[PDB]
Amino acid sequence: PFLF
């Protein structure tokens, strides 16, 4: 997962 990518959180930004």
Side-chain angles (χ1 to χ4, degrees):
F2 275 21
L3 172 50
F4 57 100

